[PDB]
Design a protein around this ligand. Structure first.
Ligand SMILES: [Cl-]
Ligand SMILES: [Cl-]
Length: 138
């Protein structure tokens, strides 16, 4: 699904993203915009490390969801960082963003917070992001 700007804004608000782990709704808006153009079915393969970015927030398969084909995990068990969101990557390609939202919340629970996405740094950090939520009634 390709969300309209204010429609997404109202949806993220309802899903409790405003101020989640200190991140304003405008920053979440800035992130989705640059990551997918508000497209839930967006995917990007990284030839470089053999991982894929899924969905509206372009969540990577190396750490956050399982797609079975990305190299990198434990062989056996113990201190296991893989599929942190406990979801099939497919779940991040649905029109309903509840799962993508829950996963994005888990991502920012780590020290880097919203900095986990390089695009946020290049395109949103230290910028006036009010434009993304203006006139949406949020
Ligand atoms: Cl799933
Ligand atoms: Cl799975």
């Amino acid at each position: 699904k390709v969300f309209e700007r204010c429609e997404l804004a109202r949806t993220l608000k309802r899903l409790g993203m405003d101020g989640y782990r200190g991140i304003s709704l405008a920053n979440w808006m800035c992130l989705a915009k640059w990551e997918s153009g508000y497209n839930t079915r967006a995917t990007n393969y990284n030839a470089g490390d053999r991982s894929t970015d899924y969905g509206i927030f372009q969540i990577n398969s190396r750490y956050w969801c399982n797609d079975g084909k990305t190299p990198g995990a434990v062989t056996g068990r113990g201190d296991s960082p893989a599929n942190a969101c406990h979801l099939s990557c497919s779940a991040l390609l649905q029109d309903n963003i509840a799962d993508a939202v829950a996963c994005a919340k888990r991502v920012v629970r780590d020290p880097q917070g919203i900095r986990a996405w390089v695009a946020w740094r290049n395109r949103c950090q230290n910028r006036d992001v009010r434009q993304y939520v203006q006139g949406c009634g949020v």
